[PDB]
DNA sequence: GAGAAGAATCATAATGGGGAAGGCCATCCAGCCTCGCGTCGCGA
DNA sequence: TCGCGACGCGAGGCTGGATGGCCTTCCCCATTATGATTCTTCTC
């Protein structure tokens, strides 16, 4: 009764923090979001071609899964391409998305978007069975509740939840230095927090802001509770007139320029400093040009720390930093992101190691029952001129010498221009070429460092195709 | 007219009564100038009234009994028709023939839906003393999807079976909790061919599942025969090669 | 469209859902400049919903609540709305009238099909 | 004268049959995915 | 040279939604019988 009562609770309530609240720690995506790449990568259209504008995809989507709404489901397709919030990058698009403005893009089909680059190295090995799969409630496709990974997101993009017990914010990092982060802990299972410190200098934004505090990023990287600064950009400029012009491009992230405009306007206009009539806040299609001039007989400095009392030049940004692994929250840290996506790695490049000894050892079974058939042939041709059935063929076959039933069949697969001697050496040279390949891959998995080589391999991929810089410019 | 088909809708649309009949009372009676009958009068005693249908014919031995909660319990399992003619012109031709050589002759008691028989020692008694029920199953497959998914599909059931009722003792199954596996309880597009399909998740062993639907539910059927004959009013009860003596020395006294 | 009259047949033909409202809507609620009520936001946080329904009119006392197998139990019986007009405004105009001088102006709770009521001893007992 | 009761005549209502309007069901059309087959590639 | 296997492309088939045709139910209209009221009839 009220035990069942409590069970429907505790179930209903996993329900809704797994299905809307923070993704696992294995993938860092959502399961929306998730479906969305599961569904455009089987789409099956490259990016190459042009991207297409449709609703047809996001109606396979629901047709894949029923929501409380697709218009959300094309609000998480939006916000996957709001690069100004979340950083590089998920779509491949055209259409109306706007910026960190209050832009209200209703045009919903009429967007242009498929696959994006980072996508495609990003889901590969769908094909090596990595990952397991579950049945919708429509009982006709399948779908995987995690995904492979070519690279922590987790760190790449951070999260902002909801209270649902209690939202969740997580900042951006770096590409490069997400890498060296890799390599440092590969190469070191007792590194420190001075260790993070230098494979990540600080975490970055794809707008900037400046991050003044250092024992807040410390109890930030260790505890997973603190709050930082968030300050916008600074430049003292000085007019020909003798006015201390104020000069700001970066700001605190998510902060509109507007409504921030028009509280200093308020602030202004409510019996306070009124001959600041000087914002030149335009011409932001270029970067950002957001340019006041302070009145004569007034400093700019103390209006910067007065609009830094008003919290929107400068703001007290808090991290709650938690993360969802088997079926619980957690209070996060490092070494377990990291030894998290290491074993993840490890699961996913073992797992593809025994489907390619599968493939190979298939494959290997038949050039063996197609070099023993290569080897004499004329009397198994006359055995079979004494017979009339390929029962009796696969009988006779058996009598001769040692097969299987798919090798018997194959051997009577065979044409007149399967009686070459030629194809014979090349039968027999790809043979020894993937028995090499069979005893490689055994070999690599009685090597462990092997396999963090392979990862080695695959992060020197990424980065000779791809590294970012730190736009974010962060001053301790 | 309107009828329901057959789940346990008997449409009675009294007004709606537009109908004929079938082309084989042609071949039932033809007694217009043919002395057979005896005749009782009813209006002040007046007008006839036979009192048996004389034929050329044992369609309706074929065809089946229902007369049950009168006195004692009776009926009359059907046959179909074509080896029914095979053996009765074989007794014909030959008046000393055994009982087990017209069962090679003779099938099964048939059925209009198409029922799936098993057992034949129930026929060895019935063929005999009409008394005993055999075990009767319905036409059921294990289907593979697209996907690898498993589905019990059903054809028809046997006699006395409606689709509904057992579809909600189906659904009481899903809530009495007492079956696992079944996902999906579905029937669409029965009237170009009937086609109800239950649906079960993998890893559920779907074939003793089946056993379990034969075991407990009425699909399975335990049909019983009772024919307990009556000749000239006094009760009796008769073996197959009887009713088709009866039957002969009818048809002797309708040509003389 | 196809409904049942009201003896346990809800023809639920969703191909056949065809349909407008009624005019008391109109009477319900107009804020459309109105700066009345919060709003909640859905689809990556972006599209209003309002948390309540204001009005100027207390139809929905009069209506009926159906709100049982959640927690505990509760409804709202139904009434008529003139009589209940009449006892509104007369504590409007009169804020320190007693109840069961409007229970003078409020008969008892009303309900559609039309009933047979005896009995003042519950109505005493519910209206408090 | 006067008063009451009975038979007959007129009007009203109900039943059945036929006509018309709208609703539900099946069929077809197009789009997308899967299978098979052909061209290419690898080895002696 | 020669043979087998694998990937990509085109064609076919199936599903859902919309549209049209025909069937059934209710209403109305006329005919016939019953009830009531009026005129005539009876007795001191």
């Known amino acids: 009764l009220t035990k069942e009562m409590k069970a429907s609770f505790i179930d209903y309530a996993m329900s809704v923090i797994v299905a809307r609240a ?61 690069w100004w919030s979340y950083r590089y990058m998920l779509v491949d698009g055209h259409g109306n998305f706007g910026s960190m403005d209050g832009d209200s893009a209703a045009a919903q089909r009429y967007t242009e978007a498929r696959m994006s680059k980072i ?65 440092l802990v590969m190469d070191n299972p007792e590194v420190t927090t001075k260790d993070l410190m230098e494979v990540l200098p600080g975490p970055d934004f794809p707008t900037g802001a400046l991050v003044m505090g250092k024992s807040g990023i410390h109890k930030a990287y260790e505890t997973g509770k603190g709050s930082i600064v968030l300050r916008s950009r600074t430049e003292i400029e000085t007019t020909k007139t003798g006015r201390e012009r104020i000069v700001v491009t970066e700001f605190p992230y998510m902060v509109n320029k507007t409504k921030v405009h028009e509280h200093i306007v308020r602030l202004v206009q409510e019996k306070r400093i009124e001959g600041i009539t000087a914002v030149r806040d335009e011409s932001n299609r270029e970067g950002v040009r957001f340019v006041i001039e302070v009145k004569r007989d007034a400093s700019a400095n103390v209006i910067l720390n007065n609009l830094f009392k008003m919290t929107q030049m400068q703001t007290n940004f808090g991290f709650n930093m938690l993360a969802i692994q088997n079926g619980i ?148």
Do not use: C, W
């Open 22 to 82: 923070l993704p696992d720690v294995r993938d860092g995506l959502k399961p929306v979001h998730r479906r969305i790449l599961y569904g455009m990568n089987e789409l099956g259209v490259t990016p190459d071609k042009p991207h297409k504008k449709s609703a047809r995809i996001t109606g396979d989507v629901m047709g894949k899964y029923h929501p409380h709404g697709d218009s959300s489901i094309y609000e998480a397709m939006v916000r996957m391409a709001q």
């Open 119 to 183: 996508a495609l190295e990003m889901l590969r090995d769908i094909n090596k069975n990595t990952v397991d799969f579950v049945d919708n409630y429509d009982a006709n496709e399948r779908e995987p509740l995690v995904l492979p990974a070519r690279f922590p997101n987790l760190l790449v993009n951070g999260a902002t939840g909801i209270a649902v017990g209690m939202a969740t914010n997580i900042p951006p990092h770096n590409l490069g230095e997400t890498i060296d982060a890799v390599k």
């Open 329 to 476: 929250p957690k209070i996060l840290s490092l070494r377990q992101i990291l030894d998290a996506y290491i074993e993840h790695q490890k699961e996913v490049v073992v797992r593809r190691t025994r489907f390619d000894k599968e493939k190979a050892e298939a494959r290997a079974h038949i050039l063996e029952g197609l070099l023993i058939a290569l080897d004499h042939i004329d009397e198994v041709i006359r055995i079979i001129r004494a017979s009339e059935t390929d029962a009796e063929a696969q009988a006779e076959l058996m009598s001769k010498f040692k097969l299987s039933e798919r090798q018997s069949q194959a051997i009577l697969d065979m044409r007149l221009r399967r009686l070459t001697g030629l194809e014979r050496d090349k039968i027999q040279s790809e043979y020894d070429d993937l028995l090499a390949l069979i005893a490689d891959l055994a070999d690599i998995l009685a090597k462990p460092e092997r396999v963090s080589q392979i990862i080695k391999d695959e992060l020197d991929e990424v980065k000779r195709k791809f590294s970012d810089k730190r736009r974010t410019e962060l001053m301790v």
